[PDB]
Every structure is written in structure tokens, then in C-alpha cells.
């Protein structure tokens, strides 16, 4: 469960992932791309 949103922070990735998974989002920023998991 990896998406394609450009980031430079995990709080730039908690924008698409909390629009997806709600509030149970494990939002990780590796390189400059976003991953959306679950808490």
C-alpha cells in the first residue's frame, strides 16, 4: 500500500493518507514519495 504523493516530511503524507484511511493512517515519507498504511 504505496501511493504517489511527493513529500519532504511524513506530515505532507498525512494529508493524502488521512483523506484515504481516515485517522488510522501510517503515513511514511521515504525519498520524496508517500506511503499509506494503517495504525
Curated annotation (Swiss-Prot):
The modification Asparagine amide is found at residue 39. Disulfide bonds join 7-29, 13-34, 17-36. InterPro entries: Scorpion_toxin-like_sf, Scorpion_toxinS_K_inh. It is found in: Secreted. The keyword Disulfide bond applies. It comes from the Eukaryota. Has the structural arrangement of an alpha-helix connected to a beta-sheet by disulfide bonds (CSalpha/beta). This is Potassium channel toxin alpha-KTx 2.1. The lineage of its organism: Eukaryota, Metazoa, Ecdysozoa, Arthropoda, Chelicerata.
Amino acid at each position: 500500500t504505496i501511493i504517489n504523493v511527493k513529500c519532504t516530511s511524513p506530515k505532507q503524507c498525512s494529508k493524502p493518507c488521512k483523506e484515504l484511511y481516515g485517522s488510522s493512517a501510517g503515513a511514511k515519507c521515504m525519498n520524496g514519495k508517500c506511503k499509506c498504511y494503517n495504525n
